[PDB]
Design a protein around this ligand. Structure first.
Ligand SMILES: CC(=O)N[C@@H]1[C@@H](O)[C@H](O)[C@@H](CO)O[C@@H]1O
Ligand SMILES: [Cl-]
Ligand SMILES: [Cl-]
Ligand SMILES: [Cl-]
Ligand SMILES: [Cl-]
Ligand code: NA
Length: 129
């Protein structure tokens, strides 16, 4: 599923991401835009052979099991394919674990490089929440 901007903002707000660990909703929408272009089916392979999955590009090196990243962890205790669903619940629940692990949203490279220190409220402007 390719979400609309405001559609995803509302879905994330319903799942508890607004101000989660102090990150306002626009941070999460901005990260999704630049990680996946709002597409739940996005996948990208990393140099080390791990793969990033879903709307927030969660990495199999640490967070999910895809059966082909030897020696990796599965800290969200999910198959990576669950992160590709049109229902964002599994991605949101896993993201809550990631952002709580001490490094905040810096775990998302696109957030650090393209959202951090910008007017992220712009990503939710005009949306009915
Ligand atoms: C939280 C998470 O899994 N972030 C991943 C990061 O590990 C990976 O290096 C990057 C590659 O583009 O995509 C995402 O930012
Ligand atoms: Cl915001
Ligand atoms: Cl594996
Ligand atoms: Cl959903
Ligand atoms: Cl933080
Ligand atoms: Na893994």
């Amino acid at each position: 599923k390719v979400f609309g901007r405001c559609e995803l903002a509302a879905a994330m707000k319903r799942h508890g991401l607004d101000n989660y660990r102090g990150y306002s909703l626009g941070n999460w929408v901005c990260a999704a835009k630049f990680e996946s272009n709002f597409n739940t089916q996005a996948t990208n392979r990393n140099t080390d052979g791990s793969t990033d999955y879903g709307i927030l590009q969660i990495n199999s090196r640490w967070w999910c099991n895809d059966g082909r990243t030897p020696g990796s962890r599965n800290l969200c205790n999910i198959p990576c394919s669950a992160l590709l669903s049109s229902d964002i619940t599994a991605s949101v629940n896993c993201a809550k674990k990631i952002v709580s692990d001490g490094n905040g949203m810096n775990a998302w490279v696109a957030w650090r490089n393209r959202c951090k220190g910008t007017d992220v409220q712009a990503w939710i402007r005009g949306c009915r929440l």
